[PDB]
Scaffold this active site. Structure first.
Site, short mmCIF file in Angstrom:
data_model
loop_
_atom_site.label_atom_id
_atom_site.label_comp_id
_atom_site.label_asym_id
_atom_site.label_seq_id
_atom_site.Cartn_x
_atom_site.Cartn_y
_atom_site.Cartn_z
CG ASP A 152 -3.48 4.39 -2.60
OD1 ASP A 152 -2.79 3.42 -2.20
OD2 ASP A 152 -4.53 4.77 -2.04
CG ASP A 184 -1.99 1.12 1.15
OD1 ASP A 184 -2.13 1.74 0.07
OD2 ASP A 184 -2.62 1.39 2.19
#
Ligand SMILES: CC(C)Oc1cccc(CN2CCC3(CC2)C(NC2CCCCC2)=NC(=O)N3c2cccc(F)c2)c1
Length: 369
Positions: free
Chosen positions: A219, A36
């Protein structure tokens, strides 16, 4: 290549995230961890949950140190609560090092873990500014760089599943053509600046401040390309116009309806390509990344292939998620405060592209303050 043992170290289920194996504690406890770049905490499931196949058992780790402080991490779609501690951590198909890192032991959660995703924790690769409880909790990558000689850079090849996370360098087998870099505007999220948007080469013609209102981030943890409301509305209006050979329900563009085609008949050629221009490393110079409908139309898990439109509305800025990253090899060059894009080594008429240079004036005005 020298980084060959890190190739193909990621796995995933379509639209459920990409994960890497991480070994924690002594004796070893290996878990599958979501990669992440949109968060900064290293956290693992540490108690039974119906969606977890395995979890971290602190009592079995002789090297575990309790930090005696709780931690809570909340989002629009999910949240988790846990206990802070430190333990020895290694990435078996990553760098050849072992570090003592902060680890949040997740004891309770709400809509965080995904049923059938095969991951049990999260590796927050962004900066300390957005770590919880605060910026004093050193993120994993910072610990890695402080404790070892591993270079301050990582790169991601997400194949739309498997992929590669190369830690400490760049593997040339993972991309074709040139790498083009955009500055990391601020070290919190991996914040970047979008200076122009085109649909099939046609400029969306919005003030570029709108593309980055209130930020634009890269992201790996978010599935979609998320766009600020005004940009989303103009982008959908243009995509609809460019794909006029077929009519879709209004709800399809809102992700409320799916459209399915007979196996292998998806008319990719009717949907447009989308180009995002990013600020370059030289004054007035930009470059563009172009994504295909194979990236922004996501398959939903028969004789029918169902797709979800994976461009969606945001009220917290642009999010260049897996929809964007899947077309490219993305280099998170923390040492030089820049992010690199190249065509990923992972149809017969069109290909994703990274092209430049272009001349774009007043790019400094595109950023939100
Ligand atoms: C692969 C995705 C869909 O599944 C997950 C599940 C858990 C975590 C992540 C990574 N990750 C966690 C944070 C994330 C995106 C995905 C988010 N990010 C925003 C933070 C503020 C700035 C703009 C981006 N807002 C949400 O609600 N998220 C979320 C999404 C789904 C579930 C969730 F709990 C939180 C992803």
């Amino acid at each position: 290549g020298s980084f060959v043992e890190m190739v193909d170290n990621l796995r995933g289920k379509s639209g459920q995230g990409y994960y890497v194996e991480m070994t924690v504690g002594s004796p070893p406890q290996t878990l599958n961890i979501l990669v992440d770049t949109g968060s900064s905490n290293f956290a693992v499931g540490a108690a039974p949950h119906p969606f977890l196949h395995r979890y971290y058992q602190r009592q079995l780790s002789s090297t575990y140190r309790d930090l005696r402080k709780g931690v809570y991490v909340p989002y629009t779609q999910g949240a988790w609560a846990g206990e802070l501690g430190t333990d020895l951590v290694s990435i078996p198909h990553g760098p050849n090092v072992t570090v003592r890192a902060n680890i949040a032991a997740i004891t309770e959660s709400d809509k965080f873990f995904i049923n059938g995703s095969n991951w049990e924790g999260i590796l927050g690769l962004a900066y300390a500014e957005i770590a919880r409880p605060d910026d004093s909790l050193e993120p994993f990558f910072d610990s890695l760089v402080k404790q070892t000689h591993v270079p301050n850079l990582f790169s991601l090849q997400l194949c739309g599943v498997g992929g590669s996370m190369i830690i400490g360098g760049i593997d040339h087998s993972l991309y074709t053509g040139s790498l083009w870099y955009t500055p990391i505007r601020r070290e919190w999220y991996y914040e970047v600046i979008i200076v122009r948007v085109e649909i099939n080469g046609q400029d969306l013609k919005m003030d570029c401040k709108e593309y980055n209102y209130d930020k634009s981030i890269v992201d790996s943890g978010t599935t979609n390309l998320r766009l600020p409301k005004k940009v989303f509305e103009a982008a959908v209006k243009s995509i609809k116009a460019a794909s006029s050979t077929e009519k879709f329900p209004d709800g399809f563009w809102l992700g409320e309806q799916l459209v399915c085609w007979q196996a292998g008949t998806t008319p990719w050629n009717i949907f447009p390509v989308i180009s995002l221009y990013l600020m370059g490393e030289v004054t007035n110079q930009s470059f563009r990344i172009t994504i295909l409908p194979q990236q922004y139309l996501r398959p939903v898990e028969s004789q029918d292939d169902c797709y979800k439109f994976a461009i969606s509305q945001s009220s917290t800025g642009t999010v260049m998620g897996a929809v964007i990253m899947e077309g490219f090899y993305v280099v998170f060059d923390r040492a030089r405060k820049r992010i690199g894009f190249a065509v990923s080594a992972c149809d017969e008429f069109r290909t994703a592209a990274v092209e430049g240079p272009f001349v774009t004036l007043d790019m400094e005005d595109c950023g939100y303050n």
